[PDB]
């Protein structure tokens, strides 16, 4: 009665039908002693959802897979061991949903890097009898309390939602590599989508000197408004990197692909011993290419970063409220039709800058 | 009259004869205000000498090329603006010999990364009328003051010479990534050869917990003698990484072939947000693919390091003195025959662990 045995969600079984999710009922994950159960209110559309649904990284790990991992909802139940939340709290869930609670990472604000971590969707939870996790395009969500985040009362759910993944995912590497105060440091942000448009704002808020990089200049005016001090359209200014020798303290890639992205040219603009970090994750088949030479010129490193920690989520929300960092969203009532539309438009790149699904009651009640 | 108009060296003009250098005379570089002129005493045999002589990655940039860049010698002359060295001083030269003196990198302990820098051999020196630089298999050497290092009296020349390249090449990434006091830190050193044998000793001297890696156990007893605290034979213990979860603060690849490395195994043993760095690899311009997924689970990074700074060299030498860090060398009177024998063996891996050419007074007029 409090929690139904089955949840409802918009689901896909075949990657050929990645853009045609359909209403499905499915057995819920067990509620473990540290678990929190939400009645979902909103969910953002992350390009990770599309990569997952299209099997561009790996095959779908279950039938009727429900994606979505920028979730805001209300607590309707908690396990007996939950200490951090109570029924009626409005909270958020991002891209990871549980960890082992018994490793050093779990106890030192690296729980998103737990070796036995379970993603919010498409992932086997070994703590829940190998339940393959179900996401947030759904009436309800379950996550371990370490992966459920308090939402400030003044942040409306729709704007709060993309911060649960896009936000924390770009905030984590910026604070880790630049410090909270990034004054004097130059930061490049590649790929001005969901993640990138938030990275511009967060980097600007930290005091950094921000260069926005995009394949074209169509997003220039908005990027400038979002906190970029500098804009480069790499498809138009083909030799841009020649003016940026020894310039960047850090480069953060937020692009969904490898299409217009010459990694060597980016590395050539880093200062000595600085990092290029890709939070962007193209399909598994697609890679960047780059010679030992250009690594050698700079002592530059290439790497990636995954999500962020709960400590970091709290810091990020504080900073966001402080400097008015908010995602630019387009709200869409959840439905088979609207999810199809929104997935297709997101794939087409037609969005400024994040779709957020809303009005869950009309769908699931 | 102080400096001879011509120097003598064992030189090659055809990469087909990479391993059979012949005595030859050549006009010296002009002596610039910050230049230092050495009468050479010893020169270590570095593997990059074989890379260069064989032209495997870059063609010979002059006729009668003289390689060798692990030089110890005695100052016979200085340009009018030198202040740090006086005639009679016993000094050393590594793999870079000059830099622009007018960029941030030169200004800030990164002169080895100067964009207009000149290698100790086979490099056009834009400051010296495009003279193609000549190395230390020779009677004399000329280098810029910032690339000439004072040798402490307690360091014999033959033992000091490999510190000028191998030593700094491995010490720089250690100090840059572990800090100079690396107590409590775990470091992995891959490839126990010319470079790795010094890397073990430096890492141990800095206070680190050192794991030595090689394909077989053949170098294990030696690695243990050189400062390794434990050893992994990756061809014998194929699942070794299972016992090193979340272990390493840094991993340094000491010229082990990246193709022959299973990078993913090493990366899976790093702590969060750490680096796998490679040194001593040929500066090939051939591309190779990189994927963010390779690094994602650890927030890891991959990159390179090139030589090191004079500041770092000074620290390295003090450390070597305090802790008795010293290469294991096989001394070889310089001659055509001995150069051939040593080049052949060094190419083979058949040296324990560095050849040092000696007795220059008998070879040279
Ligand atoms: N590391 C992590 O933990 C997380 C990673 N991600 C990943 O981050 C990436 C971005 O996600 P999100 O911001 O939602 O995606 P969006 O589609 O919202 O934005 C992606 C941006 O990439 C650029 N782009 C689009 N197609 C290509 C292509 N073929 N090649 C290169 N660039 C392209 C566009 O920027 P422009 O028009 O400026 O060129 C676009 O705005 C995805 O790969 C996603 O899987 C997401 C969440 C977390
Ligand atoms: Mg003077
Ligand atoms: Zn993801
Ligand atoms: Zn854990
Ligand atoms: Zn310079």
* C-alpha Rg of chain A (nearest Å): 20 Å
Note the overall shape of chain A: globular
Q: Regarding CATH, which class of the largest domain in chain A?
A: Alpha Beta
What is the architecture of the largest domain in chain A at the second tier of CATH? Alpha-Beta Complex
User: What is the CATH fold-level name of the largest domain in chain A?
Assistant: Quinone Oxidoreductase, Chain A, domain 1
The biggest sheet of chain A amounts to: 7 strands, mixed
* Percent helix range of chain A: 10-25%
The oligomeric state of the chains shown is homodimer
Attached small molecules: NADPH dihydro-nicotinamide-adenine-dinucleotide phosphate, magnesium ion, zinc ion
Q: What's the number of structural domains of chain A?
A: 2
Distance between the termini of chain A: 14 Å
CATH superfamily of the largest domain in chain A: Medium-chain alcohol dehydrogenases, catalytic domain
The chain pair with the largest interface is: A-B, 40 and 39 residues
Proportion of strand residues of chain A:
25-35%
Structural class of chain A: alpha/beta
Number of strands of chain A: 21
What is the count of DSSP helices of chain A, taking H or I runs of 4+ residues?
10
């Amino acid at each position: 009665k409090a929690v139904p045995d089955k949840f409802q969600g918009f689901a896909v079984s075949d990657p050929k039908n990645w853009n045609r999710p359909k209403l499905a009922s499915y057995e819920r994950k067990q509620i473990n002693p540290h678990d929190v159960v939400l009645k979902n209110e909103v969910c953002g559309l992350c390009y990770s959802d599309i990569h997952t649904l299209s099997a561009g990284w790996q095959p779908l790990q279950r039938d009727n897979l429900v994606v979505g991992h920028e979730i805001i909802g209300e607590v309707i139940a908690v396990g007996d061991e939950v200490t951090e939340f109570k029924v009626g709290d409005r909270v958020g869930i991002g891209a990871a949903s549980s960890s082992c609670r018994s490793c050093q990472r779990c106890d030192s604000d690296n729980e998103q890097y737990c070796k036995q971590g379970a993603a919010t969707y498409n992932s086997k939870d070994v703590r829940s009898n190998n339940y393959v996790t179900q996401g947030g395009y759904s009436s309800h969500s379950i996550a371990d309390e370490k992966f459920v985040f308090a939402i400030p009362e003044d942040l409306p759910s729709s704007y709060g939602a993309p911060l649960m993944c896009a936000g924390i995912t770009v905030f984590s590497p910026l604070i880790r590599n630049l410090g909270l105060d990034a004054r004097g440091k130059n930061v490049g942000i590649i790929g001005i989508g969901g993640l990138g448009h938030l990275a511009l704002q967060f980097a600007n808020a930290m005091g950094a000197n921000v260069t926005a990089f995009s394949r074209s200049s169509s997003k220039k005016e908005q990027a400038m408004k979002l906190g970029a001090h500098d804009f480069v359209a790499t498809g138009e200014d083909k030799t841009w990197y020649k003016n940026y020798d020894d310039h960047f303290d850090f480069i953060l890639n937020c692009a969904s692909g490898i299409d217009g992205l010459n990694l060597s040219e980016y590395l050539s603009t880093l200062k000595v011993d600085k990092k290029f970090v890709s939070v962007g994750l193209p399909p598994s088949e697609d890679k960047f290419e780059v010679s030992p030479f250009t690594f050698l010129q700079q002592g530059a490193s290439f790497g990636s970063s995954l999500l962020g920690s709960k400590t970091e989520v709290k810091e990020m929300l504080n900073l966001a409220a402080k400097h008015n960092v908010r995602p630019m969203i387009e709200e869409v009532p959840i439905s088979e039709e609207n999810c199809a539309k929104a997935l297709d438009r997101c794939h087409a790149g037609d969005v400024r800058y994040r779709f957020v699904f809303t009005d869950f009651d009309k769908a699931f009640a």
